[model samples]
Target: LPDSIDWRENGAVVPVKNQGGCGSCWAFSTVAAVEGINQIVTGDLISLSEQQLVDCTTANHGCRGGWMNPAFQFIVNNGGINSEETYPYRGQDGICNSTVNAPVVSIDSYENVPSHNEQSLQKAVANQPVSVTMDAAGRDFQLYRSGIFTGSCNISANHALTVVGYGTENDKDFWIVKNSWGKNWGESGYIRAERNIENPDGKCGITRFASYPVKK
Candidate 1:
């Protein structure tokens, strides 16, 4: 893993959101990731909807949990995803359908990493902002404050969030993450984790990937 990574020089800080108690975390992370990249690429921070991904993509299980790779594949194969205003958001999981009419932009595949390997995680971030997995199963996660967040977490609890960037603050190095539970959740819908901490699978928060748009 590379020693360090930075996004302030290349990417933009995005408003964080929360998925609440819904099992649509996969959708939130997917849309949030796209929203950030779209903002940087188009200079517009348009808030996309997660309900669209939940209701449209057959890849996600909605509330039951799913993977980022399949979610990205759904976007790529389906032509694109829709914005939140068009479909709105209803923090509830339901069956997907085809009645939704929304604008979408084509994206590439969903990159995958083992568990917690800074090396692989850095490689993914260097290429593009990626969707990161975290263990947000406890009440503490739902009430995390800004700054250093060190506590025992259930990594299997919540599989949500986008890895927007990674950097150091006050001599502490951490992963800059974007959440979907709204701005009131963590540090304005974002959180930071130790980059080198060993995760349950013997890895850290760096073991994840983001979906990129394919050149037209």
Candidate 2:
């Protein structure tokens, strides 16, 4: 882990995704983690199926609200997921299409970063991109652009995203978070949260709940 690590340069950052009108951030987060680790381990960047999780993952709610932990378990137990090119994203939930077969990648384990610790999250991202939940129910997050997001963020972790890299600009340190709200949102489908290294939890409840996948 140098002074900074970028999954984008590592060819781990996939295209900016869109969740549409659904609250399926968990699916987006889970798919991002899988895509990152699969690329890092196998040197191949293949977008996994969020729609599979949205419709097939019975352990979590589809498009309503969910977390990343159960989604990882669902992927492991389901014998891997299909590629996004094959399964594609529907934005909305539909019937679980288990009768088809289009396997891509699988993970063996996933773990949460040590709670409320910026250093832990930083070190984890050095290895691969991480799935994170944050307090993102404000206009600041909704229409964010450029600059590190150092705003009035609450403690309730509501929305999910991926931490793909870390950097510092003109003495302002920030985390490169890739969002699922499409390329039109934020800095081309990304947000830079102020890296609150002074506080254990970083800003916007980011460090409170972050996890990543491990390839099998």
Most lDDT-accurate candidate: 2
Candidate 2 local lDDT, 1-216, one digit each (tens)? 668888998899799999999889999999998999999999999988899888887877898888888989888888788899888888887888877646789899899889888888899999999999988998777768888898777767899999999999989889999999999888999999998566666788899899999886
Question: What is the alpha-carbon lDDT of model 2 when measured against the actual structure?
Answer: 0.88
TM-score computed on alpha carbons, candidate 1: 0.80
Whole-model Cα lDDT of every candidate shown, in order: 0.64, 0.88
Which residue pairs overlap in candidate 2's backbone?
none
Model 1, CA-based lDDT: 0.64
